[PDB]
Structure 1
Amino acid sequence: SNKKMINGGTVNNWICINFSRQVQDNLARTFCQELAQMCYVSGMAFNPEPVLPPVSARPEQVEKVLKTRYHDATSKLSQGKEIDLLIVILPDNNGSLYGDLKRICETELGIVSQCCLTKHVFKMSKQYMANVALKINVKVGGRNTVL
């Protein structure tokens, strides 16, 4: 048996930010759609569409891009609703970007985030997607089986 979802969590509102120069907008878009689909069919409630389309940013602007995109997306929601998930596409080798990302999301924005390496965005294998869905589920309060 592979791990599966016991209780599927809910992602009604999400956005994507891309930090890889090898990834065009449409590919980030397509990647997130496949991930959203996997999350759903695994047992989550997961909106097939993001609050805002993906945006591409330079790692040097991590603080600015995250805070601005967070503000703009949140202001788009019905009053009192909040963003459930940020999906981040990042370069295979990213130095301090991963850590910066997590510190900002954890301690300033208070948003759940899922990082995805460029290599996986190009391959988009079903096994990868299933694994990332499992991680997302736990992060938003769902529960998975144990082996």
Structure 2
Amino acid sequence: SNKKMINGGTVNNWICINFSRQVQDNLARTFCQELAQMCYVSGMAFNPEPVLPPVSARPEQVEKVLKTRYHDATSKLSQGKEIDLLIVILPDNNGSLYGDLKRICETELGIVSQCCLTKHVFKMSKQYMANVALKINVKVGGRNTVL
């Protein structure tokens, strides 16, 4: 028995920001679609479409891109609704980016985030997707089985 979802959480509103120069917009798009699909079939409610298309940014502009995209996506929502998830694509070797990302999301935006390395985005294996779905589920308030 591999882990499974007991209670699937809900992601009605999500966006993706990409920080990897090896990843074009369409690949980010396709990756997120596969991830959304896995989350759904595993037992989550998960909108197949993001609030806004993926955007690509340089790691040096992490603060600016996050706050701007957060503001723009939120303003697009029905009044009172919030962004449930930010998917972030990172270079395999990203230095301080991961930590900066987390501090901003956790303590400034108050948004749940899931980071995904470029290497995994290119591979898009079903096992990887399943694992990330499990992580996302816990983060949005769902519950998974224990081994």
Structure 2: how far apart are the matches of 1:16 and 1:98?
A: 15
User: Deviation of residue 75 (structure 1)?
Assistant: 0.1
- Could you give the per-residue CA deviations for residues 72-114 of structure 1, whole angstroms, max 9, x where no partner exists? 0000000000000000000000000000000000000000000
User: Deviation of residue 129 (structure 1)?
Assistant: 0.1
Residue 60 of structure 1: aligned partner: 60
Structure 2: how far apart are the matches of 1:62 and 1:8?
A: 30
TM score, norm. by length of structure 1:
1.00
1:105-124 residue pairs with structure 2 within 5 A?
Answer: 105-124=105-124
User: Deviation of residue 3 (structure 1)?
Assistant: 0.1
Structure 2: how far apart are the matches of 1:104 and 1:61?
A: 12
Residue 36 of structure 1: aligned partner: 36
User: Deviation of residue 124 (structure 1)?
Assistant: 0.0
User: Deviation of residue 10 (structure 1)?
Assistant: 0.1
Residue 86 of structure 1: aligned partner: 86
User: Deviation of residue 8 (structure 1)?
Assistant: 0.1
Structure 2: how far apart are the matches of 1:65 and 1:14?
A: 15
Query: Helix, strand or coil: the match of 2:2?
Result: coil
Q: Percent identity?
A: 100
Structure 1: how far apart are the matches of 2:14 and 2:27?
A: 17
Residue 14 of structure 1: aligned partner: 14
User: Deviation of residue 123 (structure 1)?
Assistant: 0.2
5+ residue gaps, structure 2: none
Calculate the aligned-residue CA RMSD, in Å: 0.1
User: Deviation of residue 121 (structure 1)?
Assistant: 0.1
- Equivalent pairs counted in the alignment come to 147
5+ residue gaps, structure 1: none
Structure 2: how far apart are the matches of 1:98 and 1:36?
A: 22
TM score, norm. by length of structure 2:
1.00
- Could you give the per-residue CA deviations for residues 19-58 of structure 1, whole angstroms, max 9, x where no partner exists? 0000000000000000000000000000000000000000
User: Deviation of residue 6 (structure 1)?
Assistant: 0.1
Residue 129 of structure 2: aligned partner: 129
Structure 2: how far apart are the matches of 1:14 and 1:56?
A: 16
Structure 1: how far apart are the matches of 2:59 and 2:3?
A: 34
Where does structure 1 differ by over 3 angstroms across 4 or more consecutive aligned residues?
Answer: none
